[PDB]
Amino acid sequence: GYSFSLTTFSPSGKLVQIEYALAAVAGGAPSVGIKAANGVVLATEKKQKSILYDERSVHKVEPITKHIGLVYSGMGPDYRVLVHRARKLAQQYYLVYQEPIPTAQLVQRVASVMQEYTQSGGVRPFGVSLLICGWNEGRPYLFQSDPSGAYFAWKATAMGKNYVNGKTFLEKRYNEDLELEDAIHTAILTLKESFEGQMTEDNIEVGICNEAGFRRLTPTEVKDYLAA
Amino acid sequence: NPMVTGTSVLGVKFEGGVVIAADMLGSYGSLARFRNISRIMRVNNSTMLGASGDYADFQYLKQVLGQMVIDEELLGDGHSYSPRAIHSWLTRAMYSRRSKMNPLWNTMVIGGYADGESFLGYVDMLGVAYEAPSLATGYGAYLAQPLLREVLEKQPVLSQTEARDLVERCMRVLYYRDARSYNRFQIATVTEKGVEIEGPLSTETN
Amino acid sequence: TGYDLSASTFSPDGRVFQVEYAMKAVENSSTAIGIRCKDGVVFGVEKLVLSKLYEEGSNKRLFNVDRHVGMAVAGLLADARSLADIAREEASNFRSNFGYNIPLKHLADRVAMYVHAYTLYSAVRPFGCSFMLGSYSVNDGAQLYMIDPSGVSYGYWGCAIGKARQAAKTEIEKLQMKEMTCRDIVKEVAKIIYIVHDEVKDKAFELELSWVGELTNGRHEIVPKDIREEAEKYAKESL
Amino acid sequence: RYDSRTTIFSPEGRLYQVEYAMEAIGHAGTCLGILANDGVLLAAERRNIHKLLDEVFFSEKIYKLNEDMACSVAGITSDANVLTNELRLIAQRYLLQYQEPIPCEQLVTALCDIKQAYTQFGGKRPFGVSLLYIGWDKHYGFQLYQSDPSGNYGGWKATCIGNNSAAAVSMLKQDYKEGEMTLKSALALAIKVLNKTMDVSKLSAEKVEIATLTRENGKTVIRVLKQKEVEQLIKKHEEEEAKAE
Amino acid sequence: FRNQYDNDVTVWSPQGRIHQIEYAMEAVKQGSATVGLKSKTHAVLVALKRAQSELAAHQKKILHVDNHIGISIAGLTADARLLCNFMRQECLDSRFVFDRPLPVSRLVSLIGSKTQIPTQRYGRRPYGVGLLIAGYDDMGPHIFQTCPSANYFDCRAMSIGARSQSARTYLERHMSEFMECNLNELVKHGLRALRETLPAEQDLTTKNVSIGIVGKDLEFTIYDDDDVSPFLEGLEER
Amino acid sequence: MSRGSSAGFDRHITIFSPEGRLYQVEYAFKAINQGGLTSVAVRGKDCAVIVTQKKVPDKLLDSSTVTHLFKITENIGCVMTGMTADSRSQVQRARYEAANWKYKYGYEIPVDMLCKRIADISQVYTQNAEMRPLGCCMILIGIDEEQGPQVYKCDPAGYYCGFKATAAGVKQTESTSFLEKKVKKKFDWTFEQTVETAITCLSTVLSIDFKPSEIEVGVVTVENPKFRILTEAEIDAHLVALAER
Amino acid sequence: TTIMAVQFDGGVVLGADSRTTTGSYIANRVTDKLTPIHDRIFCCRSGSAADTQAVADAVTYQLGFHSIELNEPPLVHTAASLFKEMCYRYREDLMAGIIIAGWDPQEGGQVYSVPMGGMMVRQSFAIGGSGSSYIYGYVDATYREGMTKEECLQFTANALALAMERDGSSGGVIRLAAIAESGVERQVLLGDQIPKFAVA
Amino acid sequence: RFSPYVFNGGTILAIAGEDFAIVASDTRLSEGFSIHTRDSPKCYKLTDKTVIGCSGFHGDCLTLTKIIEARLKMYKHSNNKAMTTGAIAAMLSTILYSRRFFPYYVYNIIGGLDEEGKGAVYSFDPVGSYQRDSFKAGGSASAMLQPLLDNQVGFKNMQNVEHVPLSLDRAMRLVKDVFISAAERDVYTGDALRICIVTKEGIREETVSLRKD
Amino acid sequence: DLLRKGFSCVKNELLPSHPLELSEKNFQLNQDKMNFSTLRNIQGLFAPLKLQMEFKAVQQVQRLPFLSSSNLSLDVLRGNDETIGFEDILNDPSQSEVMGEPHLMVEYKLGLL
């Protein structure tokens, strides 16, 4: 009962369909984002386990502009649609104002787009929650977008499956003093705490964002990092 | 505004059917650019058609008017577009095209023989449609219509041979006294048997 | 059960039931066979005379969709007639845009995708009929294609759709249709129709023929009558 | 007859979809506003108590709609974002027409019209957001306004929406110096109200979002209270209840 | 065991069957008997007006459509009057464009298409009226009957409406001698066909029979009450 | 309006399960298995090959016109598995999109971009209320210029990914296991350690040796980058090459 | 602008100049006016450059899509009809005169001559563009039937040289293309290779 | 660059007596300086009691006469009676005005019997200002015809003359003579004279000859 | 014959403001017709029917007209998810800058008025 409509508030007044997209995200593939003092790292967990699968084709830590990148945990196709329209929004803003889009504004616009499916009838909310990194005039930014359209600003957070224990792991492992080179390492540790399969070369995808802009780490650099 | 035009179409009734003719040329202004085009259609087994004016619009009509004939013959009920029906449909099409200030720059001469009674209709770019035993378009209306009407007022009913010869004489007159004309014309004749187009026919004059 | 109220619904085992009822709907209509031979394709239907009050020629099932293309249907007469009308528009559009006649293999793909396009929406329902397109042209010989309500389009040497497609297919398999002419194929078609027909339930039918091919200059036509009587007879002494 | 379609009257008159919309409000953070003679404050409970959060920037439930008037939200926060955007746009539109800042009732009614349009012709979820408005205008001075997902609204001298709303309003009714209170006397009253509507957790500046509005020198001032002022207000109320023993 | 499938027209029964269409047939069985036999030269439509109200003039079964096409309705009055307007529009447009009477056998196909369109879309109902079309064109008389199933038939004689099976049996027993009949005998045969539907206790009075004839030289003329005395008189007892 | 969202967790497309899993999408996956056909695609470093069954359960049917290898553009070809009508419709969509890409961007569409476009289109079906996922999965192949030989696969969920060698159909998981053992073992696959690999996979997973009438092979090579369907003879040649030892 | 095409036995030979004037100034003097619609089908563009270029691109789009759908090389008449439609619906907004010519398996070498306006007519030889007026007489006097590929090329080169020496909107290098069953054999006649006729 | 209009010429004339309503017109179809045909009558029969006669641009004449016939059939279908003369005139005014910004270049005169059987004639303009008159003439030669009709029918400017009611025979004589006179001076009028006599017994047509030049 | 809405007339206007008034304002429908004619002619009637059939049910439920809308699924159904033009940056519907009463704008969408 009442778990059928997406436009029917429960007698308890809580939207059960968005309640379910949260479960879809929680049943996804883990992702971790960390704000270091001079940059942001996004790392994600790859389900392309079989050797036949390729890395040269599909990517998860996928860029928006010279200085904003995403990572998700949920349904891949819904991601791809969301990243396509985030690119639209960034370019729209850049045409209107000759200015790289602020991270917060891109987050707000994407969150509005995501909410626009939460209250329409005859559609479904996106089955993904986004983690967004950016760098705007000398301070890092990290945001998480809820499928309901809510968005939050996190110093460091974990998402996807087994996230509550990743959230607790980041607790007594994070502070102001950590910086990007150490942030990479602690994010890797956070992932392997629940990796379930003892990572190698490309079991993960990592992205960074300092003033050199958003950059996806090549597998060789990740290999360098897994050495310690 | 037209670019490639045709000069004149002649047509005269006779006892048993209708004979019409039109020369084979398209003028790109004062230039005889295309010298083997045909400006005579066979609509169905009882009605032909000729046209002067823009030739691209005539080809558009060939596309459309041809298509309705197939569209009805597939039905296989047996009713067919009588010559008067094609004339009315064409009149309506060009009146509608005129009312939108995008006229079909043409002046057709529909001729047909159905139900034992001949038929000859005229439609121009402005939807001026009527019927007459003898028709002419362009400077045909000044150089060939007078001879046709002179011959018809004395003898009102013509045989096949006299009508064909009269058309040939009028074509000689047009060839002499019309700038945008060619000495290779087509004659299309309809009888009970069906549409018949002979061509090309020259004009061996003295 | 429960997963069969709309075309936009996959059954738990992965079967769109509301297109499989339609493919099972045509088994309510009488059979229709069409055989392809060296010179052309000839159709033939177990046309039912519902009552003697009907004119000889009501409920035709052998529509002409274009000069060189035929059509024999089976299923709901209304929906099949609507599809015949739709195909009549594809041929016209192709002629208007490209000048020459529409290839049969292309027409069967233009319409099959249309029947399919009604099989994936909750608003509309799938067409409840199957039909055979037949044609001949010196460029490409004779072709025959069949379209089930699901939208699957395949070309056939011998086809049969209706309530007794199985017996008809079994009997068609007994001819060397690749080595025969329409003149000798019409006789076999009438033979098949009477063999497959079940008289006990369906007295008073009207055998209805049509061929298009070399011997008719590639124009679709209902069979000239005297041939229809010779085939009628030939099927009769054999039975 | 029942809970569906947001466009059905139950056989008893009650729009059940809207009654459920005014249920999500009973779970969001407590938000209250108090009207004083010389200003207006708009306090709110910031229930994002998690420590890994950042970006304390000006607001999480206290938005600014134009040069004069500000807003607060409660309920589904995404719909609240949509509504705040619409409010800002409406205020700018009125300013574009008449070249004066919009009177507060004008904007409140303009929004309530949309919120009611969603509890009518539709087929869509009604906005499950209950707002609070604080602002100034030359027509009536300081004003405070409430709204429900139903599209209803009303001017309140002192109110509260969200969690523990009933106890807060009861204390405010029994506790209010109606018509003759200054600003930070009302600030002390608001701290007392929130101290009434705590969870088990004792409140601190990390759990409160007081904001104030002021009529000064011809320009309207909305300064969100910083850390130190809030902690000092908290110690003040703490001593006051201590000696109240 | 088919209650889920017999509510919407866009739902096939799990038997290859649309129940809604078959229920649209059942509207035709709720009208009143009407007969549409034809001869070599003429076509007639004999219909029995509804004696269901009293003291109020009976309904109007036979409808003028054009100078050469007439119709008889045996279904929902709403759908009947909605289809007759479309028929009139088609005939008017045909005379406007081609300046020729619209052939019957093409108007009937247009009806078939227009009545098939609703049979497939959601939120619509099939046109619950069965027609009887009498017409004359270049190929002489025609009698086409239309069903709510968007299926039109070419008929040498047909009856639709309540108890029309009796009339169909009678016509089937007398179809051969219909081609060679003067107008009088044709109308008498049609009147008899309509008569074999009624209960034996009542006879065809002048206030419930609505002969309408079209043919070679006669335009489609509707004969209402007392004017149908010439046709009805001379009709022998059962 | 439309028939309405069928009431149920698995009744409809957009409705979400309690742990957030679309069901009609997965039933669409299990609709691929209808037909019984299975397909295999592998690539060497200079050729990409797709091999599928050609099951004709009748002799009246024109074997020439029954097929599952369609040519999208001159350099891109696909093999469709699943319900036939949806497969052919998606081929139409692929051809249109690939021609449109060349029209708008002036160069042949790379295989990845085509597969991504079609995955995007197919995902949209998994979000509205009467469109239905096409029960058919695509396997594209081709050479772009430098990226290398590529073999991609769509699916009704809208997912797509890169494959060194893939398979689809009923006997798919076992084919995946065999093909994984293939790639683990030795991966030159010039042109011969190719197709013998695909045919060997299809046979060893399916049944005893095929004979040339049941196999449909299309190839693209680096020095011949046009989709060529192998004729009945040369397929038979590779078949004896299996037998010939 | 003196595009030219001739149908020989078994194929077609195109021909065009290379000169794109924007008044009296030569904006581009090595223009390639032989846009390949398909593998063995060509068009020649005359008139406003933008309209012809856009029309050729639209037609190559539609024709490539059609060829893929039919799984066959397209007939030249199909490309001619596709050009006719676009040039006729927008006859007011366009200033294109196209000389569609190519080869197909069915009808052999074909030359269609869609002028400004939307006509579609077949020609044994078709010429167009501004300079064609100065070689109408030459082509009428010299064309014969059954010409081979080589003398067709020589005829085309002569006609184009005659036009370019006279017309100011025509000059530069002569681009030829000999479409046949095997494939196109393009060539450019430049400088000395252009036939020269002794001025008095 | 395209003249959407052309003047084909043609003259019409109507007389309303007591039991009749004459509608007459020449049958010459002209254009510029050419005679398209000599047997194109410009009077059309609408109803057993009403006859319209149009003149001017022939294309609009054809279109208008077909629209009018269609509208009579629609009226007959909806209202179940043939239209009266006044109703047809009012409809025609409305139809003409619907193209106020693209006018029907036609001059129309309705001649027939009203509800009580007395004659009635309605005269129009290219955009539909109609009125009842006892007689009228429109078209190219209207300027030649109207003064003579004013003199002989309306007895204008004559003194001490008995106002005899206009008889049908005298009406025919008058119409034939006025068109004989008009054919002499107007180049657009001649080659025949179709006269429609609308009486209570139907519509009977007489046609005579004019100057053929 | 009324007002309180800007006397909805524009009859004086009629003729376009420019040869680039109606065409540029409705190039969305113009491109729809271009692609449909491309697909009717070559692909079939099924493809334009699909496009109409879908575009219907992407617009039925996006948001009420008096609020801004993004229309996501429509954009990646046409090529517009990676092709952005002058209709996206100039006077975006987000800041529509002119609105009427909500109700009065959501009714006409369906067409009550």
Find the DSSP H helices in B75-131: 83-99
Complete edge-to-edge strand list for the sheet that includes strand A128-136: A63-65, A68-74, A128-136, A139-145, A151-153
C-beta pairs of B142-145 under 8 Å, 24+ apart in sequence: B142/H34, B143/B170, B143/B173, B143/B174, B143/B177, B143/B178, B144/B8, B144/B10, B144/B170, B144/B171, B144/B173, B144/B174, B145/H34
Q: Is the Cβ of F104 closer than 8 Å to some Cβ of chain I?
A: yes
Residue recorded with tokens 């629209």? H67
> F52 and F69 in contact (C-beta within 8 Å)?
yes
I42: nearest CA in chain G?
G66
User: Counting beta carbons within 10 angstroms of the beta carbon of residue E213, is it exposed (0 to 12), middle (13 to 18) or buried (19 or more)?
Assistant: buried
3-state secondary structure of C32: strand
**What are the structure tokens assigned to B44, written together?**
């169905």
The domain tally of chain D equals 1
G134, G136, G168 from G163: Cα distances, Å: 6, 10, 9
Q: What is the CATH number of the domain that holds D39?
A: 3.60.20.10
Looking at residue C48, the DSSP 8-state letter turns out to be E
Q: What residue type is assigned to position H122 of the chain?
A: Y
User: CA angle G66-G67-G73, nearest 5°?
Assistant: 145
Residue among C141, C190, C164, C161 nearest C41 (CA)? C141
Residue among E123, E126, E145, E125 nearest E134 (CA)? E145
Distance CA G128, CA G1 (A): 8
Phi-psi region of B39 (alpha: psi -120 to 50; beta: other; left: phi over 0): alpha
ω before A147 within 30° of 0 (cis)? Answer: no
Task: Count the Cβ atoms, other than its own, within 10 Å of residue E44.
Answer: 27
> C63 and C76 in contact (C-beta within 8 Å)?
no
Q: Is the Cβ of F223 closer than 8 Å to some Cβ of chain C?
A: no
Strands (E), chain F: 38-43, 47-53, 69-73, 76-82, 136-143, 149-153, 161-163, 165-169, 215-221, 224-229
F91: nearest CA in chain I?
I43
Residue of G121, G124, G143 best to disrupt the B interface, most CBs of B under 10 A: G121
**What are the structure tokens assigned to A93, written together?**
């803003």
Give 3-state DSSP helix, strand, coil % of chain H, rounded to 5.
30, 30, 40
Distance CA G111, CA I43 (A): 27
Residue among A28, A36, A8 nearest A183 (CA)? A36
Write out the DSSP string of G83-122: HHHHHHHTTTT--EEE--EE--TTT-SEEB---TTS---B
* Residue from the list C27, C53, C82 with its beta carbon closest to the beta carbon of E175: C53
Residue among F221, F229, F238 nearest F45 (CA)? F221
Contacts of I50 (CB under 8 A, 6+ apart): C117
Torsion of CA B103, B109, B110, B111, to 10 degrees: 180
Residue recorded with tokens 């649209």? E24
G1 catalytic per annotation = yes
* Residue from the list E97, E109, E138 with its beta carbon closest to the beta carbon of B88: E97
Residue among I54, I70, I51 nearest I62 (CA)? I70
Distance CA D152, CA D150 (A): 5
Interface contacts (B, C; CB < 8 Å)? 19
**What are the structure tokens assigned to A3, written together?**
């778990």
Within 8 A of F83 by CB-CB distance, chain C residues are 16, 150
Q: Which of residues 161-180 of H touch E (CB under 8 A)?
A: none
Residue among B136, B129, B195, B119 nearest B11 (CA)? B136
Q: With CB atoms and an 8 Å threshold, state whether C110 touches I50.
A: no
Q: Which of residues 45-84 of A touch I (CB under 8 A)?
A: 81, 84
> C109 and F88 in contact (C-beta within 8 Å)?
yes
Write out the DSSP string of chain D: --S-TT----TTS--HHHHHHHHHGGGS--EEEEE-SSEEEEEEB-----TTB----S-SSEEE-SSS-EEE--B-HHHHHHHHHHHHHHHHHHHHHHSSPPPHHHHHHHHHHHHHHTTSS-SS----B--EEEE--TTTSSEEEEE-TTS-EEE-SEEEESTTHHHHHHHHHHH--TT---HHHHHHHHHHHHHHT--SSPP-GGGB--EEEEEETTEEEEEE--HHHHHHHHHHHHHHHHHT-
> F161 and F152 in contact (C-beta within 8 Å)?
yes
Q: Is the dihedral of CA F155, F159, F165, F170 positive or negative?
A: negative
The domain tally of chain E equals 1
Instruction: Spell out which chain I residues touch chain A, with contact meaning CB-CB distance below 8 angstroms.
Output: 57, 60-63, 69-70, 72-73, 75-76, 81-82, 84, 88-89, 92
Q: Is the dihedral of CA G188, G192, G194, G195 positive or negative?
A: negative
User: Counting beta carbons within 10 angstroms of the beta carbon of residue G35, is it exposed (0 to 12), middle (13 to 18) or buried (19 or more)?
Assistant: middle
Give φ, ψ of E106 to 5 degrees. -95, -35
Complete edge-to-edge strand list for the sheet that includes strand C69-75: C64-66, C69-75, C129-137, C141-147, C153-155
> C76 and C62 in contact (C-beta within 8 Å)?
no
Distance of CA F150 to the CA centre of its chain: 12
Q: What technique determined this structure?
A: cryo-EM
Q: With CB atoms and an 8 Å threshold, state whether I72 touches A117.
A: yes
Strands (E), chain E: 34-35, 43-47, 62-64, 69-73, 131-137, 140-146, 152-154, 159-160, 212-214, 221-222
Contacts of F154 (CB under 8 A, 6+ apart): F115, F118, F119, F122, F137, F138, F139, F140, F160
* Structural domains in chain G, sorted by start: 1-200 (3.60.20.10)
Distance CA B120, CA B139 (A): 19
Within 8 A of E126 by CB-CB distance, chain C residues are none
Residue among B30, B25, B31 nearest B7 (CA)? B25
User: CA angle D171-D176-D178, nearest 5°?
Assistant: 150
* Residue from the list C11, C153, C172 with its beta carbon closest to the beta carbon of F60: C172
Distance CA A195, CA A46 (A): 10
Q: Is the Cβ of G89 closer than 8 Å to some Cβ of chain B?
A: no
Q: How many CA atoms lie within 13 A of H114 on its CB side?
A: 14
Distance CA F193, CA G141 (A): 65
Strands (E), chain B: 9-14, 17-23, 26-27, 32-34, 40-44, 47-53, 106-114, 117-123, 130-131, 134-136, 185-190, 195-201
* Residue from the list I62, I75, I76 with its beta carbon closest to the beta carbon of A120: I62
Q: With CB atoms and an 8 Å threshold, state whether C222 touches B74.
A: no
User: Counting beta carbons within 10 angstroms of the beta carbon of residue H164, is it exposed (0 to 12), middle (13 to 18) or buried (19 or more)?
Assistant: exposed
Superfamily of domain H1-213: Aminohydrolase, N-terminal nucleophile (Ntn) domain (3.60.20.10)
**Partners of H11 in beta bridges:** H139
Min CA distance, F2 vs chain E (Å)? 7
Distance CA B99, CA H81 (A): 33
User: Counting beta carbons within 10 angstroms of the beta carbon of residue F103, is it exposed (0 to 12), middle (13 to 18) or buried (19 or more)?
Assistant: middle
Give the DSSP H/E element, type plus range, for residue C224. Answer: none
**What are the structure tokens assigned to E223, written together?**
């004969």
Q: With CB atoms and an 8 Å threshold, state whether B129 touches H102.
A: no
I91: nearest CA in chain A?
A96
Distance CA F167, CA F149 (A): 16
Within 8 A of H70 by CB-CB distance, chain E residues are 92, 95-96
> D163 and D27 in contact (C-beta within 8 Å)?
yes
Q: What residue type is assigned to position D229 of the chain?
A: E
SS (H, E, C) H138-178: EECCHHHHHHHHHHHCCCCCCCCCCCCCCCHHHHHHHHHHH
* Structural domains in chain C, sorted by start: 1-238 (3.60.20.10)
> I43 and I35 in contact (C-beta within 8 Å)?
no
* Residue from the list F59, F62, F130 with its beta carbon closest to the beta carbon of C8: F130
Q: Is the Cβ of E99 closer than 8 Å to some Cβ of chain B?
A: yes
C175, F46, F215 from F195: Cα distances, Å: 39, 12, 12
Q: With CB atoms and an 8 Å threshold, state whether D26 touches A13.
A: yes
Q: What residue type is assigned to position A175 of the chain?
A: N
Residue among A102, A70, A65 nearest A83 (CA)? A70
Q: What residue type is assigned to position E98 of the chain?
A: F
Q: Is the Cβ of B132 closer than 8 Å to some Cβ of chain H?
A: yes
Q: With CB atoms and an 8 Å threshold, state whether E100 touches B77.
A: no
Distance CA A88, CA I82 (A): 7
Q: Is the Cβ of B28 closer than 8 Å to some Cβ of chain G?
A: yes
3-state secondary structure of B206: coil
Task: Count the Cβ atoms, other than its own, within 10 Å of residue H185.
Answer: 9
Residue among A41, A33, A2, A32 nearest A19 (CA)? A2
Give φ, ψ of F173 to 5 degrees. -60, -45
Distance CA H60, CA F83 (A): 59
Write out the DSSP string of chain A: ---S-SS---TT---HHHHHHHHHHHTS--EEEEEETTEEEEEEE----STTB-SSS--SS-EEETTEEEEEEE-HHHHHHHHHHHHHHHHHHHHHSSSPPPHHHHHHHHHHHHHHHHSSSSS---SEEEEEEEEETTEEEEEEE-TTS-EEEBSEEEESTT-HHHHHHHHTT--TT--HHHHHHHHHHHHHTT-SS---TTSEEEEEEETTEEEEPPHHHHHHHHT-
**CATH for F2-245, among 3.60.20.10, 1.10.3720.10, 3.10.20.30, 3.30.1550.10?**
3.60.20.10
Q: How many CA atoms lie within 13 A of D166 on its CB side?
A: 2
* Residue from the list I64, I98, I99 with its beta carbon closest to the beta carbon of D117: I64
Residue recorded with tokens 């219509």? B145
Radius of gyration of chain I (CA): 17
> F244 and F93 in contact (C-beta within 8 Å)?
no
Distance CA F77, CA F85 (A): 18
> H150 and H163 in contact (C-beta within 8 Å)?
no
Distance CA A209, CA A68 (A): 7
| Chains A and E touch each other (3 or more Cβ pairs < 8 A) | no
Q: What is the CATH number of the domain that holds E34?
A: 3.60.20.10
Distance CA A39, CA A134 (A): 8
The domain tally of chain A equals 1
Phi-psi region of B76 (alpha: psi -120 to 50; beta: other; left: phi over 0): left
> H202 and H112 in contact (C-beta within 8 Å)?
no
Within 8 A of A142 by CB-CB distance, chain D residues are 54
> B165 and B14 in contact (C-beta within 8 Å)?
no
* Residue from the list F16, F159, F184 with its beta carbon closest to the beta carbon of A21: F16
3-state secondary structure of F140: strand
3-state secondary structure of G171: coil
Complete edge-to-edge strand list for the sheet that includes strand F76-82: F69-73, F76-82, F136-143, F149-153, F161-163
Q: Is the Cβ of D67 closer than 8 Å to some Cβ of chain I?
A: no
**Partners of H131 in beta bridges:** H123
Residue among F172, F190, F192 nearest F180 (CA)? F172
* Residue from the list A20, A21, A122 with its beta carbon closest to the beta carbon of F128: A122
Dmax (CA) for chain F in angstroms is 66
Residue among D36, D34, D33, D32 nearest D181 (CA)? D36
> B60 and G88 in contact (C-beta within 8 Å)?
yes
C-beta pairs of D80-88 under 8 Å, 24+ apart in sequence: D80/D129, D80/D131, D81/A108, D81/A111, D81/A112, D81/A115, D81/A149, D82/A112, D82/A115, D82/D127, D82/I67, D83/D111, D83/D115, D83/D127, D83/D129, D83/D131, D85/A112, D86/D111, D86/D114, D86/I67, D87/D111
**What are the structure tokens assigned to C166, written together?**
């199985």
Domain limits for position A76: 1-228
**Partners of C44 in beta bridges:** C33, C209
C133, C184, C211, C213, C230 from C224: Cα distances, Å: 20, 15, 10, 14, 11
Contacts of D216 (CB under 8 A, 6+ apart): none
Min CA distance, I103 vs chain A (Å)? 17
Q: Is the Cβ of A129 closer than 8 Å to some Cβ of chain D?
A: no
Q: What is the CATH number of the domain that holds A20?
A: 3.60.20.10
Give φ, ψ of D153 to 5 degrees. -160, 175
D125: nearest CA in chain I?
I63
Q: With CB atoms and an 8 Å threshold, state whether I43 touches G62.
A: no
Residue recorded with tokens 């938005």? D63
Within 8 A of I101 by CB-CB distance, chain D residues are 113
3-state secondary structure of F203: helix
D68, D92, H68, I12 from D223: Cα distances, Å: 12, 21, 78, 53
Residue recorded with tokens 């003092």? A37
C49: nearest CA in chain E?
E153
Within 8 A of H4 by CB-CB distance, chain B residues are 98-99, 101, 126
Q: Is the dihedral of CA G88, G94, G97, G99 positive or negative?
A: negative
Give φ, ψ of H75 to 5 degrees. -60, -45
Distance CA E98, CA H28 (A): 25
Q: What residue type is assigned to position B195 of the chain?
A: V
**What are the structure tokens assigned to B146, written together?**
């007078």
Radius of gyration of chain A (CA): 17
Task: Count the Cβ atoms, other than its own, within 10 Å of residue F240.
Answer: 10
Burial string for C102-132 (b: 16+ CB within 10 Å, else e) reads bbbbbbbbbbbbbbbbbbbbbbbbbbbbbbb
3-state secondary structure of B138: coil
Domain limits for position D102: 1-245
Within 8 A of F159 by CB-CB distance, chain A residues are 76-77
Contacts of H202 (CB under 8 A, 6+ apart): H48
Radius of gyration of chain F (CA): 19
Q: Is the Cβ of E50 closer than 8 Å to some Cβ of chain H?
A: no
Min CA distance, B89 vs chain E (Å)? 5
> C67 and C199 in contact (C-beta within 8 Å)?
no
Q: Is the Cβ of F45 closer than 8 Å to some Cβ of chain G?
A: no
- For chain F, the structural domain boundaries read 2-245
User: CA angle E11-E16-E20, nearest 5°?
Assistant: 45
Within 8 A of F1 by CB-CB distance, chain E residues are 123
> F112 and F147 in contact (C-beta within 8 Å)?
yes
Q: Is the Cβ of I51 closer than 8 Å to some Cβ of chain C?
A: no
Q: With CB atoms and an 8 Å threshold, state whether H66 touches E92.
A: no
3-state secondary structure of G174: strand
